Amino acid sequence: GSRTDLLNVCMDAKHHKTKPGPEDKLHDQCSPWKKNACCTASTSQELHKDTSRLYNFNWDHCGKMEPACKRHFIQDTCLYECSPNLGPWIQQVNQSWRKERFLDVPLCKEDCQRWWEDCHTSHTCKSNWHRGWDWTSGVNKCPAGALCRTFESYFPTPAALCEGLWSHSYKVSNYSRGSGRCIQMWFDSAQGNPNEEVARFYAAAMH
Ligand SMILES: *[C@@H]1O[C@H](CO)[C@@H](O)[C@H](O)[C@H]1NC(C)=O
Numbered sequence: 001g002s003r004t005d006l007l008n009v010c011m012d013a014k015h016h017k018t019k020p021g022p023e024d025k026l027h028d029q030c031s032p033w034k035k036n037a038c039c040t041a042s043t044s045q046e047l048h049k050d051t052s053r054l055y056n057f058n059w060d061h062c063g064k065m066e067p068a069c070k071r072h073f074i075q076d077t078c079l080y081e082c083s084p085n086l087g088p089w090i091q092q093v094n095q096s097w098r099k100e101r102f103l104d105v106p107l108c109k110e111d112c113q114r115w116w117e118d119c120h121t122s123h124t125c126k127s128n129w130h131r132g133w134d135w136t137s138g139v140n141k142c143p144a145g146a147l148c149r150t151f152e153s154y155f156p157t158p159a160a161l162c163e164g165l166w167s168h169s170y171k172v173s174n175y176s177r178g179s180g181r182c183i184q185m186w187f188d189s190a191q192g193n194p195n196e197e198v199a200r201f202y203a204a205a206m207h
């Protein structure tokens with residue numbers, strides 16, 4: 001094989017398409033991926049719906065999450081579901097309907113900082129959202145022992161948030177947005193998808 005085999009691929013998990021392709025009808029925040037996506041239109045619709053049971057996650061576990069904060073979580077979800085440029089960060093986990101996950105996606109420090117700043121006023125009860133919720137109500141709720149606190153209590157720094165939230169799905173890069181060496185969670189599609197060249201950078205040959 002070749003390192004370029006990790007370019008333009010979709011991870012093997014849950015909703016993902018088998019291979020990347022255009023999706024003219026991606027919804028709202030996911031539309032920047034419309035030219036080449038690993039998500040379907042339906043997935044993009046459902047992830048925007050706070051009460052969806054097709055895409056079930058309760059962002060309002062500690063009262064209503066501020067829109068300025070929630071938008072980042074939606075954006076994170078669009079990148080996760082739709083990106084065809086995260087091949088270099090795929091890791092095998094081999095769970096039911098979830099063969100792969102992401103490991104250490106090098107999120108631009110500016111995207112991490114802004115996410116954290118915008119979520120400073122909001123509340124949560126957990127520093128790792130990937131496991132441990134009480135799901136007996138039908139949606140995730142704060143489990144025993146987990147008190148609602150300011151985001152800053154559970155995530156003292158932006159790195160704590162981006163790296164901790166989904167068990168190291170991101171690793172903060174100190175490169176700048178548009179360096180071509182860190183993944184942007186937020187980008188407009190006007191001038192193409194800037195993460196294509198980022199994947200190519202990390203896929204370049206050894207030595
Ligand atoms: C980013 O900068 C911080 C603060 O100096 C440092 O701790 C961390 O190792 C850096 N991360 C990189 C270079 O990926």
Ligand SMILES: [K+]
Pocket residue numbers: 083084085193195196
């Ligand atoms: K992308």
